[PDB]
Design a binder for this molecule. Structure first.
Ligand SMILES: Nc1ncnc2c1ncn2[C@@H]1O[C@H](COP(=O)(O)OP(=O)(O)OP(=O)(O)O)[C@@H](O)[C@H]1O
Ligand SMILES: Nc1ncnc2c1ncn2[C@@H]1O[C@H](COP(=O)(O)OP(=O)(O)OP(=O)(O)O)[C@@H](O)[C@H]1O
Ligand SMILES: Nc1ncnc2c1ncn2[C@@H]1O[C@H](COP(=O)(O)OP(=O)(O)O)[C@@H](O)[C@H]1O
Ligand SMILES: [Mg+2]
Ligand SMILES: [Mg+2]
Ligand SMILES: [Mg+2]
Lengths: 169, 384, 52, 345, 56, 52, 57, 345, 126
């Protein structure tokens, strides 16, 4: 508590998630950055949106859902979306990825492209998408990594890239 | 600094000091010469109860002393303004030791008030002295002792902290007429003087095991427990009937109030126990149903608004209405309006009986008959 | 049955007609009591404040 | 000295159901009334005095260690009005007195009792509160240059306690019977001051606030109280069997109540339901009005013989009274009148 | 037949509810134990600080 | 017709009982206004006197 | 028509018309107890008082 | 002096539903924000600054005691950008400073506020963290040769706190409105430093980490927050009744939660389930989007009148909105916005 | 004693868990019912009066009786009287065997058969 009262936020790592294989084990709701979005690049700030609050709500919704559930359509969508984004967040050690590759996986996450892909394929989908975009969409990756900007033109480019990858999976 | 009267100079406490609160006056009587601890957590109404006890004395003839230790001066200004809004201030002495003043003044403050009250006690007059937050006096004395490099005891308090409060509180006593005559050299004869003390102790989390609370509980003749759960539940005053006790008991009450409340207090305690037991049982025996309903209605009955003391006659009437079963059919929510309407009806239509009860406090077969007739007439004719 | 019906009708009519009148009259009594109390206590308070 | 002691455990009747049943007294023994503030130690000691000391036909000493002045005055007037003060000598050190007086006042009473004993008389010694003696010692200890120990008690706590307690004994020349009230800080029996004195007594009566919270006085806990005399060789097999039965039934009920509190009573076996019922009956039957507490209750006090107590508890342990309600026993007295309250209930 | 089948369904529902209740109790116990251990350490530390301070 | 005796009583009793409540409420409002105005006049007398 | 006390209590709180009740079978329920409510429901149905009957379980 | 003090009851309105509902405060009074580390004391204080500065045209003093320098720079820059800086005096001694600066810095701000007050103005005083003053006293106390007390705090803790607090008072010559954040070490509300501060304040708002972990902001605990102004005479009957109803409903929910944890909600009675359903809606409705928190939530802030909050809470308790889901009330300014959110769930 | 005590150890170990099922043991596997009514009887047997030490022969005899299932049909309420009667019977009719057991504490088929005869002969009485 003495340290928390000094720093500008904390990243809380939860032993239960680490044991469950969710690694990095970043527990939302407790973890927060107090400088907020001001630090983020425009594109990352736009694509990240409410992810942390959605996960914080989902982690309590899943705890309650084990006992009983109501509104089983919307809650079902919330549960599957939360589970798939948690599966997307898990990343291997000694394996950093640039803002470009980060941006496009968040785009696939929040624009609904991952909605109908099963859990056991989320990581393979991500790896295939990275290898695919590395082949011929390299100029756009370079552009994103140089300037972390967001606009409708690169929005449409990402949408078309996702559509084409989803066709040829 | 002065010694308390010895064993042979005291007389038994058998006179009432009316608080004006239904719960306190009924279950936990305070007598003229008793030491009654008010104990509880912060913001539970400890000060309110004591100032209402001071307000109620405006016409009883008992002088009042309010000692403020370590409180901020604006709170004392508000208290004085509230006492002045009623007629109580002209009957009251206020001794002030604000939080800013040096520890010596704060720790000496209770003794000055004790001497001022002892002035009346030795001349044969009744005085009521409120010690507000003796815990703050103990804190000031701990500061003084630690600055003097005296060895700290448990909880960093000095060892003699018990002697401080014990020798402070033992001054409050009722003295026989002989001591008064000796003190006054025959100027006053045949009157017994009394000093009644109501110390206030603040517990941190209901933890009565702390050093100062344990000492003060050991010294006093009883305690009134106020706790946060009942206050938040809407039971105000939040008097816990189970752990609160008066060691003088029925001898301090008027005959009618004693007769009514004696069963009441233990009935409420056992009702709370039964309600703990019954909470998940679908089937209740009719006796158990009677106990549960009666206990809920009695718990609802004892709630009372601030700054609204009730005379002895009104408390007796309401307790009679509760004990003799008249409340049974009334739905729980209307109980308060039932009480208000009964008080107004009896005040307008049956004033002489109220005057008789207030003056005498006696109880007889004809008194019970008149009360029963009043209850029947109210319940038939009137509307809540 | 005819005698019981007529007797009961008259009895209940009389009882309700009396009771409602009693209730309204005593409500007027309570209103007057409150008014008188307020009227007295206003001047009682003013007489306290001037001495203050 | 060791050679002078005696073991004459003559049984003594008190007229209280729970004390006579669970924790029988013996002549020449030491009795401790443990409890927190406001549990009934003073009224229990007053009832014990009224019972035994009046009938005792012998001298008695009352040591008011750290007592309230009002209570001492009331006790003196009570003894005067009942016209027994001529047989009793009173030593008083009140709370307001400096720590030296409270520290040494008990020894004066012990000295007077020992003077009476050495004459060859049998005397009763009553101590208002043993705990306050150790508290005075703790007050003086810090200034005396001793380092603190335990919960801030003086290091010599056990030595002082043993020194005072070992003089209260019944020798071959005369017997001293003593009843001592022992304050338990915050009802924590783990505290060293109540913990140490436990070993010095013969019968120990524990008053629990948890029972007192329900208003059922004398509030004696049957599952903590015990006496050295409670063995078949003294009490006979009947009394021992009755006491053991009551203890076992109350112990079983204490376990069953935990299931009842959350799951509800329907989850129990019908035999467990019967046990809960009869135990809840026995718990109330242990209560008894004292006619030294009429001011509090407003009801007449009751006196009970040992035989009637045994028969009543035997009857409640068996099926004789399964049909009576729980409230039918509360503060009744003998079993022979619980049926009357049941009819009145 | 409907009554019998409803009784069987009641038994199944009770089995499930009791499993959930046992898991809830097992989850409560460990948090109570953590709080108790924190209090246990705190009491020892406070009392030893008092003892050392009292040896002025 | 006999069975309407209770009906005919409920046509009068409960309505009068309810009307008594608003009768009391209007007197309560009058009392509150009277006491508030008395306080507001007393304060303005006191301020004038002390300012003199 | 009601079997079991829980339904009795719930529908008394709701205030629905309950014509028949049976409780206290526990384990090993018997058809002999059931003969009653079905008899009265049949009597209602065939005399025109009831036009359709449902079992809720 | 005691004579100079002045009493005032003019309620000061805020845009925050929970604060002005449960713990309203008057012009010239003391407000204290109690909380642990990270629960949001500073955000609440900034929102109070923004709202209160609207209807107050006088001068203001902000005293930063032992807090982050970054927050001071951000506050200064945002004051300069809004061209309101010329009304505020800023005294800053932050955590980087040695203990003497943190110990004495608050008195300088108090002296400036007293200068503004004695001129006859109405001033606003904000103390960024009052706890650091006592912490600096604790740090320097041992070297001054003073024996430790309690939990190792200085023996003069109460006097040191009182001498500082007593100077922040409204007077017949001028009024001071004060808002103070009070750090709670290790979330122990029973620590001597928070315990002493409670008595000096008029309105106390307690922030709970457990509520903040739910994502409910502001994380005000309504069962511990309290104000001197919650009195039917000043606030009027309707506000008082609504506040006490909310308090009782939440207390009942707290009482039921222990049963809910083990047996689940299904075991509850049908009225208890309705109580739980209403309590959860009340808990959700207490949330409110802050204008200063837009950088965190993104959603625009809301200003809520006292009339709207009392009407909405009274409607919720009366059961008018029992058909809406819980999420409808989460982070909505007013009840009409709650029903609008319900249409899209 | 080493040979015999393992039965007691395991019987009490099993009995400890079934104590939770004791409240509603009416609906149980008959094997579990046997284990429960055996643990209960062993626990009832282990109680002993003060100042009455039992020689190794007597402890071994009652332990043999408990372990070999001879208490299966004896009622829980009567275990103590059975023990006392058995001890008196063996003290009366079979003292030499008790003497040999106290002298050696040995165990073999020649001893187990003698104990079986002792218990069969006693069970005809009382
Ligand atoms: N009987 C009552 N009914 C309603 N409200 C009450 C009652 N008694 C007290 N209160 C309210 O409770 C609050 C606290 O009262 P009070 O100041 O007497 O408490 P306290 O225990 O002395 O507090 P503190 O620890 O601040 O000294 C006030 O808002 C007061 O108006
Ligand atoms: N209305 C709100 N909406 C969203 N988040 C909020 C809100 N109020 C506070 N917070 C959260 O509170 C967190 C910490 O707030 P703040 O900096 O005010 O804490 P503090 O209590 O002053 O802490 P410290 O003790 O570290 O000084 C922020 O990261 C923010 O996410
Ligand atoms: N047997 C009893 N009957 C009635 N009231 C009792 C009984 N025992 C205790 N009490 C209540 O407890 C209060 C305190 O009893 P007392 O023995 O003086 O306390 P302590 O045990 O601390 O000396 C008395 O006022 C009385 O009302
Ligand atoms: Mg107070
Ligand atoms: Mg006593
Ligand atoms: Mg902060």
């Amino acid at each position: 508590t003495n340290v928390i009262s000094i720093t500008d936020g904390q990243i809380f790592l939860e032993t239960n998630l680490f044991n469950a294989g969710i690694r990095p084990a970043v527990n939302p709701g407790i973890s927060v950055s107090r400088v907020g979005g001001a630090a983020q690049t425009k594109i990352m700030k736009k694509l990240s949106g409410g992810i942390r609050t959605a996960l914080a709500q989902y982690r309590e919704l899943a705890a309650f859902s084990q006992a009983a559930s109501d509104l089983d359509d919307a809650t079902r969508k919330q549960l599957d979306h939360g589970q798939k984004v948690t599966e997307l967040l898990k990343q291997k050690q000694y394996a950093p990825m640039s803002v470009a590759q980060q941006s496009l996986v968040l785009f696939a996450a929040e624009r609904g492209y991952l909605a109908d892909v099963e859990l056991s394929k989320i990581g393979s989908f991500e790896a295939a998408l990275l290898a695919y975009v590395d082949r011929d969409h390299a100029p756009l990756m370079q552009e994103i990594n140089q300037t972390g900007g967001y606009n409708d033109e690169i929005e449409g480019k990402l949408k078309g890239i996702l559509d084409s990858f989803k066709a040829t999976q | 600094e002065a010694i308390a009267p010895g064993v042979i100079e005291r007389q038994s406490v058998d006179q009432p000091v009316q608080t004006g609160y239904k719960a306190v006056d009924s279950m936990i009587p305070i007598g003229r010469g008793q030491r009654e601890l008010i104990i509880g957590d912060r913001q539970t109404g400890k000060t309110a109860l004591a100032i209402d006890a001071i307000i109620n004395q405006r016409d009883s003839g008992i002088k009042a002393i309010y000692v403020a230790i370590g409180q901020k001066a604006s709170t004392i200004s508000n208290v004085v303004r509230k006492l002045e809004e009623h007629g109580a201030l002209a009957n009251t002495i206020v001794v002030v030791a604000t939080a800013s003043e040096s520890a010596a003044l704060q720790y000496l403050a209770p003794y000055a008030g004790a001497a001022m009250g002892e002035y009346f006690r030795d001349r044969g007059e009744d005085a009521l002295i409120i010690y507000d937050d003796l815990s703050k006096q103990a804190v000031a004395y701990r500061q003084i002792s630690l600055l003097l490099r005296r060895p700290p005891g448990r909880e960093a308090f000095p060892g003699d902290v018990f002697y401080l409060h014990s020798r402070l509180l033992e001054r409050a006593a009722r003295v026989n007429a002989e001591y008064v005559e000796a003190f006054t050299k025959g100027e006053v004869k045949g009157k017994t003087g009394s000093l009644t003390a109501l110390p206030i102790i603040e517990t941190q989390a209901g933890d009565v095991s702390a050093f100062v609370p344990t000492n003060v509980i050991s010294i006093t003749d009883g305690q009134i427990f106020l706790e946060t759960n009942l206050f938040n539940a809407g039971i105000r005053p939040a008097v816990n009937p189970g752990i609160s006790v008066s060691r003088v008991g029925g001898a301090a009450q008027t005959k009618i109030m004693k007769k009514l409340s004696g069963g009441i207090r233990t009935a409420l305690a056992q009702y709370r126990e039964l309600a703990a037991f019954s909470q998940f049982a679908s089937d209740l025996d009719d006796a158990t149903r009677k106990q549960l309903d009666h206990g809920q209605k009695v718990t609802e009955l004892l709630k009372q608004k601030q700054y609204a003391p009730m005379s002895v006659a009104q408390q007796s009437l309401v307790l009679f209405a509760a004990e003799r079963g008249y409340l049974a059919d009334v739905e729980l929510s209307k109980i308060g309006s039932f009480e208000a309407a009964l008080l107004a009806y009896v005040d307008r239509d049956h004033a002489p009986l109220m005057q008789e009860i207030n003056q005498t406090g006696g109880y007889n077969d004809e008194i019970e008959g008149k009360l029963k007739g009043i209850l029947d007439s109210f319940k038939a004719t009137q509307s809540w | 049955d005819l005698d019981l019906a007529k007797a009961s009708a008259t009895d209940q009519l009389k009882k309700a007609k009396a009771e409602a009148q009693v209730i309204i009259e005593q409500a007027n009594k309570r209103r007057s009591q409150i008014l008188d109390e307020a009227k007295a206590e206003a001047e009682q308070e003013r007489t306290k404040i001037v001495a203050q | 000295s060791y050679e002078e002691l005696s073991n004459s455990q003559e049984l003594l009747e008190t007229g209280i159901k729970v004390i006579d049943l669970m924790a029988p007294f013996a002549k020449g023994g030491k009795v401790g009334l443990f409890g927190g503030a406001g549990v009934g130690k003073t009224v229990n000691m007053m009832e014990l005095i009224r019972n035994i000391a009046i009938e005792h036909s012998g001298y008695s000493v009352f040591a008011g260690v750290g007592e309230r002045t009002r209570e001492g005055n009331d006790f003196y007037h009570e003894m005067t009005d009942s016209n027994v003060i001529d047989k009793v000598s009173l030593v008083y050190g009140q709370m307001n007195e400096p720590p030296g007086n409270r520290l040494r006042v008990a020894l004066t009473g012990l000295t007077m009792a020992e003077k009476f004993r050495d004459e060859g008389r049998d005397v009763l010694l009553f101590v208002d509160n043993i705990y306050r003696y150790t508290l005075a010692g703790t007050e003086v200890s810090a200034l005396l240059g001793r380092m603190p120990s335990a919960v801030g008690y003086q290091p010599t706590l056990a030595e002082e306690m043993g020194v005072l307690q070992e003089r209260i004994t019944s020798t071959k020349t005369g017997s001293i019977t003593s009843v001592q009230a022992v304050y338990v800080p915050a009802d924590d029996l783990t505290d060293p001051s109540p913990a140490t004195t436990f070993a010095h007594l013969d019968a120990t009566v524990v008053l629990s606030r948890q029972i007192a919270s329900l208003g059922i006085y004398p509030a004696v806990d049957p599952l903590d109280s015990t006496s050295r005399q409670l063995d078949p060789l003294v009490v006979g097999q009947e009394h021992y069997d009755t006491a053991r039965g009551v203890q076992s039934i109350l112990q079983r009920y204490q376990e069953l109540k935990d299931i009842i509190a959350i799951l509800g009573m329907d989850e129990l076996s019908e035999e467990d339901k019967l046990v809960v019922a009869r135990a809840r009956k026995i718990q109330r039957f242990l209560s008894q009005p004292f006619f030294v507490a009429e001011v509090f209750t407003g009801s007449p006090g009751k006196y009970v013989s040992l035989k009637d107590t045994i028969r009543g508890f035997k009857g409640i342990m068996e099926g004789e009274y399964d049909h009576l309600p729980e409230q039918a026993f509360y503060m009744v007295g003998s079993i022979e009148e619980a049926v009357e309250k049941a009819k009145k209930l | 037949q409907g009554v019998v089948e409803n009784l069987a369904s009641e038994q199944a529902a009770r089995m499930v509810a009791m499993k959930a209740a046992t898991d809830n109790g097992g989850s409560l116990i460990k948090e109570l134990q953590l709080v108790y251990n924190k209090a246990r350490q705190a009491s020892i530390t406070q009392e030893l600080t008092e003892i050392v301070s009292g040896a002025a | 017709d006999l069975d309407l005796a209770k009906a005919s009583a409920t046509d009068q009793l409960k309505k009068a009982k309810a009307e008594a409540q608003v009768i009391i409420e209007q007197a309560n409002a009058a009392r509150s206004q009277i006491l508030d105005e008395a306080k507001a006049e007393a304060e303005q007398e006191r301020t004038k006197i002390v300012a003199q | 028509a009601m079997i079991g006390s829980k339904g009795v209590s719930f529908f008394n709180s709701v205030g629905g018309n309950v014509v028949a009740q049976v409780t206290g079978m526990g384990d090993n329920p018997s058809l002999s107890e059931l003969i009653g409510p079905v008899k009265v429901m049949l009597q209602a149905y065939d005399e025109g008082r009831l036009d359709k009957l449902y079992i809720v379980s």
